[PDB]
Design an enzyme around this catalytic site. Structure first.
Site, short mmCIF file in Angstrom:
data_model
loop_
_atom_site.label_atom_id
_atom_site.label_comp_id
_atom_site.label_asym_id
_atom_site.label_seq_id
_atom_site.Cartn_x
_atom_site.Cartn_y
_atom_site.Cartn_z
N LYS A 197 -15.02 7.71 -3.54
CA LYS A 197 -16.26 7.98 -2.81
C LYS A 197 -16.84 9.30 -3.32
O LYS A 197 -18.05 9.41 -3.53
CB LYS A 197 -16.00 8.01 -1.31
CG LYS A 197 -15.39 6.75 -0.70
CD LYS A 197 -14.95 6.90 0.76
CE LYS A 197 -14.02 5.80 1.22
NZ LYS A 197 -13.48 6.15 2.54
N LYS A 207 -0.10 14.53 1.71
CA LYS A 207 -1.49 14.77 1.23
C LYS A 207 -1.71 16.28 0.99
O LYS A 207 -2.67 16.66 0.30
CB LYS A 207 -2.52 14.18 2.19
CG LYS A 207 -2.54 12.64 2.21
CD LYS A 207 -3.54 12.03 3.19
CE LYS A 207 -3.61 10.51 3.27
NZ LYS A 207 -4.22 9.88 2.05
N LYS A 235 -9.37 13.30 4.90
CA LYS A 235 -8.35 12.23 4.85
C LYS A 235 -7.42 12.49 6.01
O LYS A 235 -7.42 13.63 6.60
CB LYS A 235 -7.57 12.24 3.52
CG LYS A 235 -6.96 13.58 3.18
CD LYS A 235 -6.43 13.74 1.77
CE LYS A 235 -7.46 13.81 0.69
NZ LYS A 235 -7.40 12.58 -0.12
N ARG A 236 -6.60 11.50 6.36
CA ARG A 236 -5.61 11.70 7.43
C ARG A 236 -4.66 12.88 7.11
O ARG A 236 -4.38 13.16 5.94
CB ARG A 236 -4.87 10.39 7.67
CG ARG A 236 -5.73 9.30 8.32
CD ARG A 236 -6.15 9.62 9.74
NE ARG A 236 -5.01 9.68 10.64
CZ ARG A 236 -4.60 8.70 11.43
NH1 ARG A 236 -5.25 7.55 11.53
NH2 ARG A 236 -3.54 8.87 12.17
N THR A 246 -8.82 6.08 -1.88
CA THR A 246 -10.19 5.58 -2.01
C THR A 246 -11.18 6.69 -1.72
O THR A 246 -12.29 6.59 -2.21
CB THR A 246 -10.44 4.39 -1.08
OG1 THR A 246 -10.03 4.77 0.22
CG2 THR A 246 -9.67 3.18 -1.56
N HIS A 278 0.80 -1.25 0.00
CA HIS A 278 0.00 0.00 0.00
C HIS A 278 0.82 1.29 0.00
O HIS A 278 0.20 2.38 0.05
CB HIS A 278 -0.83 0.08 1.27
CG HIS A 278 -1.89 -0.94 1.33
ND1 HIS A 278 -3.17 -0.68 0.87
CD2 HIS A 278 -1.85 -2.22 1.77
CE1 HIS A 278 -3.87 -1.78 1.08
NE2 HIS A 278 -3.08 -2.73 1.63
#
Lengths: 815, 815
Positions: free
Chosen positions: A659, A553, A547-548, A655, A356
């Site tokens: 969504k 990110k 998201k985290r 992911t 991952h």
């Protein structure tokens, strides 16, 4: 609401079924809860409904497991340290076609089922993407009729509850079991022993692991219903228990807590290896107990282990359960007395590994000293695996000594370590990445040498999401307008959404897609007002990054854009801008200082922007507290714009991106992870793609990233860095954000400034399209219609056919 | 067995009731246990039956509590650190008249209900007499229709499971909740905060307890059914839980275990004060949470606290919950803002104290430093109580300064302490001992000064046992032969057993009493064969001493007698002696060295006696492992001779004595505790009374006890001490019993040798009567017939009328 009971995707409210649900509700309120209507609270009513709905799983649960015993299919064991399941009541009702019947029964009893649903605690037994993927996968494996068994740990405390206090993250224990869990079944009779520490005696008929400390593994089994196919699979989560037999007597009883701490709490590291012994114990705990079940169930099927890989698959969700490789070897050699070579043939054919992440600090690299102490026999087996594996390398690539050093399971240095990814590749017949771009980079770079040795091992399995939880549950309005045109088959055949491309010019469908989004926005605003007394402008574009919190990110890039919007309003106050509500949410790891500073920066930016009378309701920035699966189900259907802005090459898949696409948001993002495949499916003209591609990031790495150059050339960026540095966003503590500025200017691995100009320009195009509601909605229809690839049913069908060797089926079991 | 279903005291097996029980059994096996008949184990069948029987409590449980709300009787709160409840399935069936119906239903399903009953764990939440008295009292309060609430702690681990290994006690954790507890209802919604540590600020409108550490008290409620009166009362047991909000994050989650340790394990001290902080925390935990319920329920009845003692009684089971006195004062003064004098009037009228022991080492004497740190406001309140109490003493007894020092709640010395018994007397309107002889010695000696100040406070309440568990449950055969003659009224009116004196010459009743004893002896022998592969001679007198192991209870005197019997056989092998099986059982406190040596001596004596070919089956001595409530229910009905041989003045009451008398054993004992009253009720001619009376013990104390004199004058005793000293009973370790010999010869507080000759002579008379089976059985009939006084219904009726001010009723609630 009367409205929601007319949603045909939610099934029939049969008269006898409604009568029976009311009877059993009242039965559970009396016999199970020991309450009457005089004292009963909304929580008591939630539990009466939960017990009533759970009873509908039992017959199918027993018959499904009897069916797997009788038909003897190959069994799939999905090992994960995380199962980010969320709430269960709505999901159960959806999958059993009970939602409208339960809504009517509760209505007839004077209750609002949606208020009851809000009482349920999330089963927050994961950190983010990896854990939620495990949950979507359990759902898709049941929907596809696979004899699939999820195996993990029953954490007493899941991912911490996040509170925001004075603009800062605070962490509180997630006591999800406080009021019980009505879904699980405790199975104390099926408790198994797990061994730790001890020593190896090499003796009698071979090696023996002796003088160990025992921790018991008590399983709790949870039903996993497929979508309307009468299949109910099992998730088995192990709980640590002190052994039967043993500072004095009182202290010895208290000291049972130490063994029991193995299952106490989820490590809240997302994408970061900390190397704690307790975490290694959790990993071995899951592996040892799980493989005892696997071996016992194999022996009771229709000992010769040649047939073992024909009856067992073990899927390793990341390297966390990598000890399954040496544990299987240990059992087969030391307990079943198989020859090493035969045992290894069996192990590699049984095991497959899903990778991952590419970030080096994520990789599990356990010190050999720690393994020697805790798991001495496993370290011996790892060394033997390594010797035989490198002998194969040396035979394939004679004299390539550099290649031997690179491929070794043993990493040299001041602390010798085992590279668990290398162990997983050596001990697995299949290794997959989680999106096309990621699986390619595993072959090309990260695991190039392993790919050259065994090219046939390397696969891709692009991630997916279940369209049950992530469309039918969370967005029934959108699910209904789709079913009105194409029927309900798409719910477990999501490629049928392509039929919606026929409606890009259909006035009623354009009207209805926009209507559903607006309904979802009103509902989300109502949630923030009810739970937090926070007002949002309903006449604004909802710009969402959930998201985290990580540097990769680039929540910080979003921050730079929000400040840009603010400074442009102040410079030209009379110029119309599309109003926005910018929402950012996610948890920071408790030890991750920079991520906690980023949360404070987001709230501090709000403290200025949200109170500036020149701005008023034209721009608002809010930090959504306690982002978790149930909150995702609320905010994602409300979103207009999905922020997916990781530096190219850093996000293996994502992911949450999927969504948002399924729920009628447009996406602004980089060509990273699955964003590449989403843009391919929809057409790049229907995506707001910006910024460096991987090849550009690599060219900057080759010459060196100099953030100063961007600062020197971009006045609007220089203005913002000066506001951060001088205390404009922290006037009471002017140097508060010095570490963020220092990182951006001198130590930024994620090249925030290098994407700043393209990001701001791309965001201008977003605003330009939002000013044209018809064309906005037509582009949304083009996104929803091409989201079908991103069903986890597609993902699981590929795992089944290409790795596990089993054929999926959507065919119903009988009633 | 077909036989046992013909026992009329076990109720009717109604056809519809049997059909419904089978249906619900099968329903629970499916929906509750998620099992089918293919996989179901005997444990699964036990749980299906337990759930089925528990459902029969619920309607009566809800209606009983609604009735107390509506009728607003005075509420009785019975505070105890111990509730030695035993198993619940049989007791529930007896009290609901379901036993024959459940036996028939299970038989029709192919199951043996008695095998299912053996699966249930005891709720072993007590050490011995005090804890078992609390349990009998809950049963009698429900049978007498009192609005009574037992309050205690839900220990995760009760009294340790005792294993005997190489002849020694070993202790293992009593994991009674391993498979769940089907009887209790968790009530997390009713969780309350308990405070520890902190400081007092004296301020605003008075004192405030601040900066405390919070531990939550989560209640679990268990039904307490009365005998066939449709009354179901509640036992509320508190479980410790860490507070909602808070080494780092992981360690902070793990450290929740420290607060949660408060309810982890029962302190296994019987009759001994250890002074551990954790034990003080348990005591305060129970008191603080309980009194919050009491105050809240008072306020919700039909704030003015003048009426509080008319609506509340608090009964203190020993001094363990003595902190209820200063806690009530703290709440009334600091939170309700009552004047001190008014608060004290209310507290004394609400509280009453039961004293259970005379042994000084049993008395709770907490260091003031520990109280200051843990409970600073309570220590301030204790000092104020002490000042005002001693002012009353000084006014009643002017210039008696010696009396002030003796009566003070504060004990001076190198460590200043609070005498919790003195606090209880000062803060209680009634103080009772637990048998006539004990209550008299409290007035005459132990609390003479308090008696002289307030004579009206001092009462007697002779202990009792419930004839449900201790006759109908454990000895249905005897219950049936009694009911055949006098009907069933005696089961809740035990004085009716006096009618059996009419049958002392009745041939059929003499035959039947003997038959039932023999059946019970066969059943007990079968238990030892099945569970331990231990053989006992069925043609022997079963001589039983079961109770906790203590020097005061003189298991060592029994040992001297067993060795005497052995040496007399060896001296005159041809002389007939009545064969005996001498059984001794009971737990030693894990830190009590002498008690653990006594257990080893009993097993070591067996190792010689039980293997001597000259003796063979004429004498056997066995140590009954793991004595507990369920074992008492098995062995007591099998017993011929009850050993009750404490030194006169040491056993306040006893209750095992009563259990033996009710079940058809004759008693050998001293004039100590309730043995005096048992001999009075039956006539001394029907009891084997021996040894020093209290007045004789006191005369020996005055001149000094010289064990050497007994040794020098009694050859048979000298022979035994020489066998112990020289290694006859430990040939591999000849000095093993040196500490027992040294204690007996030089440091014996319990005067074992002074009762040796009378005990041996008395035991000769026992054997002489046993040789005449008819006269043995006629004497048994005279004992069973006069056991009625020892019903806990009699005891509770006296507490109700003489302390609590409530009138008992055996009248049924409706169905």
């Amino acid at each position: 609401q009367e409205k929601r009971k007319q949603i045909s995707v939610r099934g029939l409210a049969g008269v006898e079924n409604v009568t029976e649900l009311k009877k059993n509700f009242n039965r559970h309120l009396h016999f199970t809860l020991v309450k009457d209507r005089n004292v009963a609270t909304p929580r008591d009513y939630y539990f009466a409904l939960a017990h009533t709905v759970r009873d509908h799983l039992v017959g199918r649960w027993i018959r499904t497991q009897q069916h797997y015993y009788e038909k003897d299919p190959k069994r799939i064991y999905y090992l994960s340290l995380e199962f980010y399941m969320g709430r269960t009541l709505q999901n159960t009702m959806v999958n059993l076609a009970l939602e409208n019947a339960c809504d009517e029964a509760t209505y007839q009893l004077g209750l609002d089922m949606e208020e009851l649903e809000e009482i349920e605690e999330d089963a927050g037994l994961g950190n983010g993407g990896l854990g939620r993927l495990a949950a979507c996968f359990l759902d898709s494996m049941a929907t596809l009729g696979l004899a699939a068994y999820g195996y993990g740990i029953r954490y007493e405390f899941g991912i911490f509850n996040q509170k925001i206090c004075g603009g800062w993250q605070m962490e509180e224990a997630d006591d999800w079991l406080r009021y019980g869990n009505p879904w699980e079944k405790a199975r104390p009779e099926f408790t198994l022993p797990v061994h730790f520490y001890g020593r190896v005696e090499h003796t009698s008929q071979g090696a023996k692991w002796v003088d160990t400390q025992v921790v018991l593994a008590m399983p709790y089994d949870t039903p996993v219903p497929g979508y309307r196919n009468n299949v109910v699979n099992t998730m088995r989560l192990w709980s640590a228990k002190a052994p039967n037999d043993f500072g004095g007597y009182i202290q010895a009883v208290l000291d049972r807590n130490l063994a029991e701490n193995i299952s106490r709490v989820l490590y809240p590291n997302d994408n970061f290896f900390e190397g704690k012994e307790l975490r290694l114990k959790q990993e071995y705990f899951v592996v040892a107990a799980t493989l005892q079940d696997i071996i016992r169930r194999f022996k009771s099927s229709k000992t010769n282990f040649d047939a073992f890989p024909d009856k067992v698959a073990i899927q390793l969700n990341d390297t966390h359960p990598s000890l399954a490789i040496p544990e299987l070897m240990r059992v087969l050699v030391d307990l079943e007395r198989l020859d090493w070579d035969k045992a290894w043939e069996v192990t590699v054919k049984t095991c497959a590994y899903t990778n991952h992440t590419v970030i080096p600090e994520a990789l599990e690299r356990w010190p050999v000293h720690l393994l020697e102490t805790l798991l001495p026999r496993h370290l011996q087996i790892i060394y033997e695996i390594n010797q035989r594996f490198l002998n194969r390398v040396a035979a394939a690539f004679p004299g390539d000594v550099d290649r031997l050093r690179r491929m070794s399971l043993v990493e040299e240095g001041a602390v010798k370590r085992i590279n668990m990814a290398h162990l997983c590749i050596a001990g697995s017949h299949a290794v997959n990445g989680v999106a096309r771009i990621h699986s390619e980079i595993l072959k090309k770079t990260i695991f190039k040498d392993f790919y050259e040795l065994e090219p046939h091992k390397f696969q891709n399995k692009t991630n997916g999401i279940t369209p049950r939880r992530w469309l039918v549950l969370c967005n029934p309005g959108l699910a209904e307008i789709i079913a009105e045109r194409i029927g309900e088959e798409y719910i477990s055949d999501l490629d049928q959404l392509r039929k919606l491309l026929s409606y890009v010019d259909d006035e009623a469908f354009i009207r209805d897609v926009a209507k559903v989004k607006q309904e979802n926005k009103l509902k989300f605003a109502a949630y923030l007002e009810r739970e937090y007394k926070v007002h949002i402008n309903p006449n604004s574009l909802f710009d969402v990054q959930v998201k985290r919190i990580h540097e990769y990110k680039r929540q910080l890039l979003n921050c730079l854009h929000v400040i840009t919007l603010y400074n442009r309003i102040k410079k030209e106050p009379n110029k119309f801008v599309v109003p926005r509500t910018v929402m950012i949410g996610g948890k920071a790891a408790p030890g991750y200082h920079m991520a906690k500073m980023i949360i404070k920066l987001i709230t501090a930016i709000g403290d200025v922007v949200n109170h500036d009378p020149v701005v008023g309701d034209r721009l608002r920035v809010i930090f959504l507290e306690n982002y978790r699966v149930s909150l995702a189900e609320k905010v994602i259907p409300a979103a207009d714009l999905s922020e997916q802005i990781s530096t190219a090459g850093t996000e293996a898949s994502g992911t949450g991106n999927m969504k948002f696409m399924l729920n009628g948001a447009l996406t602004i993002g980089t060509m990273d992870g699955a964003n590449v495949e989403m843009a391919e499916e929809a057409g790049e003209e229907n995506f707001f793609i910006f910024g460096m591609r991987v090849e550009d990031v690599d060219r900057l790495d080759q010459r060196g990233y100099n953030a100063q150059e961007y600062y020197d050339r971009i006045p609007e960026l220089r203005q913002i860095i000066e506001q951060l540095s001088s205390g404009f966003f922290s006037p009471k503590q002017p140097d508060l954000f010095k570490d963020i500025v220092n990182m951006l200017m001198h130590h930024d691995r994620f090249k925030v400034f290098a994407d700043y100009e393209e990001y701001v320009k791309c965001q201008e195009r977003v605003s330009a399209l939002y000013k044209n509601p018809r064309e906005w909605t037509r582009m949304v229809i083009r996104n929803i219609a091409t989201s079908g690839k991103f069903s986890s049913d597609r993902t699981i069908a590929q795992y089944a056919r290409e790795i596990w060797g089993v054929e999926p089926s959507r065919q119903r079991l009988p009633a």
